[PDB]
Curated annotation (Swiss-Prot):
Name under which the protein is recorded: Lysozyme C
Subunit structure: Monomer.
Principal place of residence: secreted
SUPFAM superfamilies, per the entry: Lysozyme-like (SSF53955)
The organism's taxonomic lineage, starting at the top: Eukaryota, Metazoa, Chordata, Craniata, Vertebrata
Biological process per Gene Ontology, one example term: defense response to Gram-negative bacterium
Species name: Gallus gallus
Tree of life domain: Eukaryota
Homology family: Belongs to the glycosyl hydrolase 22 family.
Record bears the keyword Flavoprotein: no
Record field: catalytic activity: Hydrolysis of (1->4)-beta-linkages between N-acetylmuramic acid and N-acetyl-D-glucosamine residues in a peptidoglycan and between N-acetyl-D-glucosamine residues in chitodextrins
Function field: Lysozymes have primarily a bacteriolytic function; those in tissues and body fluids are associated with the monocyte-macrophage system and enhance the activity of immunoagents. Has bacteriolytic activity against M.luteus.
Amino acid sequence: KVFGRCELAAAMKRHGLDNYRGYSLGNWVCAAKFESNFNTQATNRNTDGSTDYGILQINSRWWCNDGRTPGSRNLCNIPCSALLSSDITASVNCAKKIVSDGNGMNAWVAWRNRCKGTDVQAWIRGCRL
Ligand SMILES: [Cl-]
Ligand SMILES: [Cl-]
Ligand SMILES: [Cl-]
Ligand SMILES: [Cl-]
Ligand SMILES: [Cl-]
Ligand SMILES: [Cl-]
Ligand SMILES: [Cl-]
Ligand code: NA
Ligand SMILES: [Rh+3]
């Protein structure tokens, strides 16, 4: 599923991401935009052989099981495929664990490089939230 911007903002809010670990909703929407272009089916292979899955490009190296990432963990206790669902519950719940890991949203390189410090509120402008 390719979410609309405000559609995703609303779903993220309902799932408790607005201000989670201090990160306003616009931060989450901005991260999703640059990670996946709001596409739940987005996948991308990393150089180390791990893969990133879903709207927030969660990595098989630590967070989910895809059966093909040697030495990796599954800290969200989910198959990586669960992160590609039209229902964002699994992605959100796993994102909550990631952002709590110590480095906040810097865990998402695209958030650090493209969202951090910018006017992220623009990402939820006009949405009925
Ligand atoms: Cl957009
Ligand atoms: Cl915001
Ligand atoms: Cl594996
Ligand atoms: Cl594990
Ligand atoms: Cl599994
Ligand atoms: Cl959803
Ligand atoms: Cl933080
Ligand atoms: Na894994
Ligand atoms: Rh939902």
